[PDB]
């Protein structure tokens, strides 16, 4: 364990609320984060409108900093449904604001989720993304 940071993006998932129920009752919502070709999702929540994951995610950049082009992809759907085109909502977090030469963690809450059509689904999800600039002898 050498002393040195190689760029790492942490994506904390608190919980969601205001989810569009279903005819049956309550679907199985699940957070799905995608960054640096890394698909990481949170523990699927059973029949519950406001699922509470309160988990922490991490992504290795390998000395690769952020840019105005870098962003996080947040997609929420119903586990019970995989193939079907059932989509609860989505949201993209532009890390262009977190970019810089000094760690910066901005709490992203009250995010409006949009369906595959781009219409306000009426669901909100809290997330805390933290950026960390790489630094050390091993540059890549």
> What CATH number does the domain containing 49 carry?
2.60.40.150
Residue 2 burial (CB < 10 Å; 0-12/13-18/19+)? exposed
- CA–CA distances in Å: residue 114 to residues 62, 75, 78, 99, 107: 32, 9, 14, 25, 20
What is the number of structural domains in the chain?
1
Strand bridging mode 29-34 / 39-41? antiparallel
48: alpha, beta or left, given left = phi > 0 and alpha = psi -120 to 50?
A: beta
Tell which residue, 26, 27, 55, 46, has the closest CA to residue 126. 55
Tell which residue, 111, 120, 130, has the closest CA to residue 31. 111
Boundaries of domain holding 81: 1-140
For residues 6 and 61, the answer to whether their CB atoms sit within 8 Å is yes
Strand bridging mode 52-60 / 8-17? antiparallel
For residues 125 and 31, the answer to whether their CB atoms sit within 8 Å is yes
For residues 125 and 16, the answer to whether their CB atoms sit within 8 Å is yes
Which residues touch 85 (CB under 8 Å, ≥6 apart)?
116
List of E strands, 1-119: 8-17, 29-34, 39-41, 52-60, 71-78, 89-94, 104-114
Helix (DSSP H) and strand (DSSP E) numbers for the chain: 0, 8
């Amino acid at each position: 364990g050498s002393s040195g940071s190689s760029g790492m993006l942490r994506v904390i998932v608190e919980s969601a609320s205001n989810i569009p129920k279903t005819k049956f009752g309550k679907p199985d919502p699940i957070v799905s984060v995608i960054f640096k070709d890394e698909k990481k999702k949170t523990k699927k929540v059973d029949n519950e409108l406001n699922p509470v994951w309160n988990e922490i995610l991490e992504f290795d950049l390998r000395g690769i900093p952020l840019d105005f082009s870098s962003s996080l992809g947040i997609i929420v759907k119903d586990f019970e449904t995989i193939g079907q085109n059932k989509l609860i909502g989505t949201a993209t977090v532009a890390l262009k604001d977190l970019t810089g030469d000094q760690s910066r963690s901005l709490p992203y809450k009250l995010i409006s989720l949009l369906n595959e059509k781009g219409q306000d689904t009426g669901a909100t999800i809290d997330l805390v993304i933290g950026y960390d600039p790489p630094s050390g002898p091993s540059s890549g």
